[PDB]
């Protein structure tokens with residue numbers, strides 16, 4: 155028992171991280187087979203970072219303008235292209251440590267592990283959610299761009315995030331590995347802002363089931379609710395709507411605990427209306443929304459990866 | 461910016477995990493050079509787990525009673541010995557993936573990353589503290605024994621914990637890698653219990669400095685306190701005493717923020733006496749004590765490992 159914000163083991167991704175330098179800019183790249191993926195803002199200069207024209211900026215570059223370092227071994231670039239907001243650096247050596255992998259574009263509400271990196275060297279790993287407003291509340295400093303977010307399914311690394319920038323509220327924005335930003339953000343230093351966020355309702359409910367699986371029961375009640383009536387309360391506390399789909403995904407956890415999904419919605423309603431009154435759930439004094447129903451089942455069941 | 465419960469990259473440890481089977485018991489071992497380290501309770505039977513005599517139990521074993529699997533490759537045991545509560549299985553093959561490593565026995569209050577494993581296969585990584593009462597609040601199921609806790613310093617893995625058991629409150633107990641339990645616990649199924657825990661004061665203060673570094677300032681005040689007077693308040697809220705040593709370790713963070721250590725103790729006092737009054741610090745509605753001063757500096761500065 156116990157319940158922790160668990161990240162995936164990071165070894166398969168660590169073996170893929172490299173340093174990319176262009177001009178006076180250094181950041182991280184992701185080396186898979188003979189291609190290095192990194193944010194295209196690496197070709198930006200400190201002068202045109204307000205409204206850069208990246209096609210224009212890239213056609214001026216040569217392969218040798220890109221310094222790629224994998225450990226203490228220099229990778230030679232033999233080609234470059236840009237796909238949306240990511241640069242693809244073709245190198246003459248395929249990464250022998252390339253795991254089985256996929257690129258996936260996740261939905262808001264989904265979680266992933268971030269391997270934070272500086273100078274192509276990993277600093278730490280932590281678990282994130284894609285917020286409903288398409289930011290992530292990460293931990294990123296200067297130099298962390300090109301660090302990736304990912305999930306693992308048995309032996310396969312699904313890459314889902316690459317870090318590009320920090321917004322004025324201190325939250326973070328980035329792209330999928332094909333370079334499409336999550337949310338309305340753009341890779342120029344303009345007046346963007348996160349947009350109103352909401353709490354991921356289906357995840358809160360998952361975490362309440364995690365609590366029950368682990369012996370916290372104090373928040374349960376005998377009442378129930380309809381899905382419509384629950385969503386009327388959710389709206390007013392800035393929770394996102396719960397769909398019949400969400401109810402269905404919560405099926406297994408409902409079945410394991412014996413607590414109908416709508417019954418747990420009724421507990422969530424009372425928690426929203428009364429607060430927690432000095433008590434904690436799974437070591438938290440807030441309702442936690444960065445565990446998906448899948449995350450809860452994986453951790454409470456002991457699923458491994460290889 | 462941002463502040464997350466960050467674990468060390470787990471790749472160096474993943475390459476060391478193996479499965480150890482003895483009789484009807486399977487758990488994890490740690491393969492470093494030609495030795496596999498695992499909990500000695502692997503030789504226990506479901507009959508004598510109340511008061512087992514492990515010397516007696518071990519002298520009855522042969523090498524071939526131990527099945528060690530590294531991936532899908534069987535490791536042959538050519539010798540065994542017991543050191544305190546860990547078994548050392550000598551195998552005929554040195555782990556080519558052996559990192560540079562040390563064994564260290566940590567003090568309560570110190571943090572480490574846990575690579576949770578089942579059947580020699582990693583499940584997840586998360587950050588822990590050694591509680592003052594020498595338990596850890598982990599996430600461990602059947603089969604997780606032999607999962608290790610660790611820190612990394614540049615290129616060197618310092619192993620500090622190996623998981624052995626779960627206590628009736630759902631918290632966890634284990635040993636250092638030389639098999640000495642942390643705390644008064646013993647590897648038999650008797651009437652042990654965790655003992656009263658306390659909050660790690662120096663770590664709470666570190667995390668308040670993390671908050672200031674990241675822009676949370678609402679909890680600061682103009683007052684100050686003496687170390688004695690602070691500790692009078694700490695005692696009553698079940699915080700452990702703050703020593704001049706702790707004050708000294710908090711030096712760098714004090715210097716970076718411009719907030720004297722005793723000034724931040726005065727904020728902590730008011731937080732203890734008034735609660736947080738609906739506000740959060742670094743996304744938490746509780747005072748967080750599982751970040752050491754070192755953890756804060758590492759994350760807010762961007763230190764990497766290689």
Ligand SMILES: *[C@H](O)[C@H](C[C@@H]1CCNC1=O)NC(=O)[C@@H]1CC2(CCCC2)CN1C(=O)OCc1ccccc1
Pocket residue numbers: 181195198203204294295296297298299300318319320321322326340341342343461
């Ligand atoms: C890549 O290493 C950084 C990561 C930032 C630095 C602070 N925290 C982070 O996550 N990315 C950027 O600095 C990014 C590059 C930029 C150039 C043109 C388009 C994108 C501007 N930018 C950015 O995040 O600007 C906002 C910012 C900058 C510094 C500090 C806070 C916020």
Ligand SMILES: *[C@H](O)[C@H](C[C@@H]1CCNC1=O)NC(=O)[C@@H]1CC2(CCCC2)CN1C(=O)OCc1ccccc1
Pocket residue numbers: 155487501504509510600601602603604605606624625626627628632646647648649
């Ligand atoms: C090793 O895989 C397990 C890990 C436990 C299982 C539940 N959560 C965990 O962390 N260790 C044990 O089961 C451990 C072995 C034992 C045999 C003789 C000495 C030690 C008994 N024991 C243990 O933790 O007992 C308490 C317990 C058992 C099952 C469920 C909850 C608590």
